[PDB]
Amino acid sequence: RVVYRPDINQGNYLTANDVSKIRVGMTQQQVAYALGTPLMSDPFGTNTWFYVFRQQPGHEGVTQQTLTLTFNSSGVLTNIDNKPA
Amino acid sequence: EVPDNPPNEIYATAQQKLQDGNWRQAITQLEALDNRYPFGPYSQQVQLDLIYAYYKNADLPLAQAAIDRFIRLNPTHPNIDYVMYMRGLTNMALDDSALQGFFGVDRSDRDPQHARAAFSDFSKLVRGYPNSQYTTDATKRLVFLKDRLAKYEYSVAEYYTERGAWVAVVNRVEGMLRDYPDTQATRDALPLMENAYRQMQMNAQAEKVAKIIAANSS
Amino acid sequence: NYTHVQVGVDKKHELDGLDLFTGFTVTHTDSSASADVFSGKTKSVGAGLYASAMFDSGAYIDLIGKYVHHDNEYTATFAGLGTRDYSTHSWYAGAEAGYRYHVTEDAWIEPQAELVYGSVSGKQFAWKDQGMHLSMKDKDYNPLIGRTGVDVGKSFSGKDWKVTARAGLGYQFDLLANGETVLRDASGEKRIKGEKDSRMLMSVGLNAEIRDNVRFGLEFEKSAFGKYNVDNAVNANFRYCF
Amino acid sequence: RYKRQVSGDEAYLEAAPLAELHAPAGMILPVTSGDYAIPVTNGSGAVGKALDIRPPAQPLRTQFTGDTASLLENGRGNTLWPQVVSVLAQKNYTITQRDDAGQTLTTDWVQWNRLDEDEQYRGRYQISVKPQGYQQAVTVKLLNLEQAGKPVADAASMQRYSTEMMNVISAGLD
Amino acid sequence: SGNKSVKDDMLKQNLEASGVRVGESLDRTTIADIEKGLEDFYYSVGKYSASVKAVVTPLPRNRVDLKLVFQEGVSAIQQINIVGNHAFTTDELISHFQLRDEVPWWNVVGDRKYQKQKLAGDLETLRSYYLDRGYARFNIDSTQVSLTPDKKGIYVTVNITEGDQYKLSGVEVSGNLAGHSAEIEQLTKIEPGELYNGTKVTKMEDDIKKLLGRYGYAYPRVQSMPEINDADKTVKLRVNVDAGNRFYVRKIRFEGNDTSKDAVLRREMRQMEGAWLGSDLVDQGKERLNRLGFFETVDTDTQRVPGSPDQVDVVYKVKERNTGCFNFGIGYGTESGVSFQAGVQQDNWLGTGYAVGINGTKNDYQTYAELSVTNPYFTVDGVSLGGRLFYNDFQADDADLSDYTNKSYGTDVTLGFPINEYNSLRAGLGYVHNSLSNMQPQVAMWRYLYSMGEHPSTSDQDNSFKTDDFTFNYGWTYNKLDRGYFPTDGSRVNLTGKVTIPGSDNEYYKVTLDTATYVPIDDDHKWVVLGRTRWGYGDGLGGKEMPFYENFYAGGSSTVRGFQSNTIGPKAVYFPHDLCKSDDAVGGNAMAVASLEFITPTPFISDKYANSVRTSFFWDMGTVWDTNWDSSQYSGYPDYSDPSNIRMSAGIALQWMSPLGPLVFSYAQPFKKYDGDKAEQFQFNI
């Protein structure tokens, strides 16, 4: 509408350079160091990891590019899942 | 202002007029007696009466100071259950009582602090000495405080759902269900989690927590 | 009808069984008076100092004294006064002694007396607007007034009563009435002065409170129209904040 | 009443008792933190206004072991029994039902302690026996059933006060 | 007993903290320790004629009591010199020191005691003064205090090295910084040909820290060394900044609010929970909380969780203040019959955020009542809503003197929405019925009646008329302040304009403006100038005239003061029953008032109550006038269409925030007075 809408950001943002740093087959401490601590985590069953983008200046289209990681119960990455919209 | 006379009569008068309920004059007499008889034969009984007077006279902070003085004075007394219960009662009484009590306004979404402190104190009491005389009402108070804290967290999650910051809601309700899994607040907060997952375009988890509702249809 | 407001500060200290006290203050009293042929608007603003001492034996001695500047705009038809502004200073000081003895545990019996002396310049003006000279002037007025009053005060506390209930009665009689004035006329001239008074009084209504956030007020008034058609003003209000 | 009760904010009793959250097959709820945890606890305790809030009386080797008041080390301990007789009646209109002189063996009569707090006449019986264990002739008073306003009660608080009235009498006068 | 320089309180906490306090044992080693410690504290004060003496009083039951005797005669500063320097005079240096040797006769600004920490701070100021002007090769070789052989006079001397000037050749930046380096170089763009300034460099590190916090790095690390080319008489700066780690707010927490709920505060705080922290966002949030006006003090704290390396939680410690109140009162009296009054005005009802105002007053002279309710946050975005109903059937009937009986009532509903960071537009509709009756014959009102097509007689004092009005009103409130009561920064302007829609008896329009700004002079914001102004203009339309009753008034508290409550304005003239000039005014259609004010803390009461009160000097400049004025009718009487007849005064003002509410007290003296001033001197508005 017309009313002022304050800026809203509700996620962990990382640019494509850190996305390129992702590669399967390495521990958890390194990926936490590389992408930052996960602001999201599934607490049921699988201990998968989530990273999300929330960005909308106000009355404008939201920008979302999710990025998911799967870890077995051993401390090593299984697969990733990028999505830009 | 005070009679400097042998102690027997001042103790006797002190208990007699506390027995009347003259707290405004009893607190001064008791504090002067304690400060002039620091190590009398039964100064413990003096300190307990001071606790009683301070609580009933609604001077809660000084009562708290007297509590944490007594606990370190003798951490092993055959009546510490009463002191711990009085401390928890002081916390809870300090927490929630105002014009809202007359108006019946739900005091849920208010500043917890004292609520958390009271819960911790009462839990320490009940897990310490289950054979005491102050366990039943204590347990009921534990239940009530747990419900209050859960409702507070549910309220803040509800406001975030009203805004549209669909991540912090996930974290807050996850903390709720990790800490407070056995209360009504999570029971009506789960749909907020479902809504957040649906709006977050990551519905792979959404139906997952939806199955949770499938286990509590009632 | 009048409104009078005063403020000030005070300093005090105790002694060997005595509590000396003194201080300074200022005051301002505005008034409006209506009569058949006279309508006046007066303002007396000034300042002064006071003293007050008491002991543990149940005796208190107090005194006040201030000078003000009474200026009044009066509209009068008789004597051709018109709208005249009579302005003059006035310095008055009084003393009093009371003994609030402990009648019981919930009241204190206080007999007290007071006496005050004050001096003010007269109202000297010419009535030439009436056609005749009719010189109107007054001598140096030096009125004095004494009074005797007894009371009982409820020293309530506990934040449940916490009131200042008081009862009793007092009588005020003029100690000096030297308000001499001189008037002139074509047939002759006259001089006038004042006489004594026998005014009565009453007590205060509630003056109630409970805690550091509630204050209740209520005043008791008397209108003894039998003696001199006298009257009083009373009020009742209370203040609380959330 | 404003005398022996907690504040009137007692609506917390009628709160909903907690119910557990089922975990469906195929997933597991996250492990409970346990910081806000209550274990199972017994009952049989007065709650609300029925619960008593009074400072338990600390007895005055000032014995305090609840049902016993065995204080103790005087070479003239046997002379305390006639002192107890002087306490009875003479000093406080009391009497021992069956008190031997040398044996120091007495049985207390049903008294009446009207020490306000709406506490009616309390009939406390006891056995007055003077032992000499680990010391000289000691004082001991094993109380018995108390009446108070009710026909009978066995709450340890009022029982403690009932024994402690005799305890404080004995301690104060000797 | 004995001490007077320091209040006995800090002495008792000095004893208490050291380990000795009422009720515990005694340790004579601590007696000697505390004796020497209090002597040392007195030497720090500068009172070297001090000898604390301990009096031991044994008491039965193995007790003791300690008395202290303090025979402090008199302290001394008597000489300061800057020996070693050559390029600056001593006095200009003395102009900057906190500690002064002596001050001339026509001022009492400074005392003459010696405090060692004051000397240390003075040395810091001297060092900064020399370094920021280019003299990098500077230090403090040696400073010596000295005492005369009487213990009544102390001198201080400093010994330095002047060094030489140096030029800022150029700067750079190194280390693993943020990927946004371009703006860092922008902010560190240094133009050569300028001398050195250390404080400039310090501000550079500070605002680099601020900017990196704005990007989202909250714990950086910045340092800089000035590589100094002594041969070339120049310097360069080598700066090192670390990127830190992207920090994130796990939980946002509030603490202190006993009354206000979580939602009302969480509704504020543009900084969001669960995102990358920005210190600017946190500052904006704390400023907004201060802006709400019902929190006596609010302060932010940031605490990283003891868990993950980069997760921080922010807490907002508050202490609410009591605002809003209800009043009640009966004013019985034979001259006044029976009178009655009640009402509650609360800015924040029960903490829910709603605002309410209710009142009702009843007497033979007046019957008045009003209701008002508003929610500032109808939606979650911030749109407002409010409603107001009122009833004003006063009927000032007795003596039928210099008034006109009216019964009036009205209901209006408004809504407003925020449009930017600091502006909220407002629109609303309203209905109002008025009924005038009896009246009294006097000029300047009959023009309004004749404008409607009716011509009642002028000799009679009876008659009546009724009117119904539909109005559309709008408003615009630009606000940027630091707090909600007697602020210390910013400005606020308010526009309110009302018009009448077709189908209403009245046909007119109305506009008002207000502007209050605050300009500090001290960085700590304790002395500040204040600028108030109010403007207002309105009139009829379509050949008709604006209603007389809705016109402007001037005079009273928060207006031009000292003159009288509602006194400024042209005075009416009465019809014969020739023309008799009125004493009171009726109200001109255009008002404009200005005021400048100089704030100063009161030097009597201590700092515990200091935040509560505020006193000042003020200079009231106001004037109201009516553009519509038939000069030809009564030009014999003075013409007041010209606004040149200014009314103004000056004086002092005081505001006290009692637990019973706001209080104001003002003293003023009119200078350019006119007829009908009815001046007063003090006011007690609430």
Residue numbers in the entry:
A (entry chain E): 25 to 109
B (entry chain D): 26 to 243
C (entry chain P): 1059 to 1300
D (entry chain C): 30 to 89, 96 to 107, 109 to 210
E (entry chain A): 100 to 175, 177 to 677, 698 to 806
Give verbatim excerpts from the published study on this entry:
The outer membrane is a formidable barrier that protects Gram-negative bacteria against environmental threats. Its integrity requires the correct folding and insertion of outer membrane proteins (OMPs) by the membrane-embedded β-barrel assembly machinery (BAM). BamA is composed of a 16-stranded β-barrel, which, in E. coli, is preceded N-terminally by five polypeptide transport associated (POTRA) domains that extend into the periplasm. Unfolded OMPs are delivered to BAM by the periplasmic chaperone SurA, but how SurA and BAM work together to ensure successful OMP delivery and folding remains unclear. The results suggest that SurA binds BAM at its soluble POTRA-1 domain, which may trigger conformational changes in both BAM and SurA that enable transfer of the unfolded OMP to the BAM lateral gate for insertion into the outer membrane.
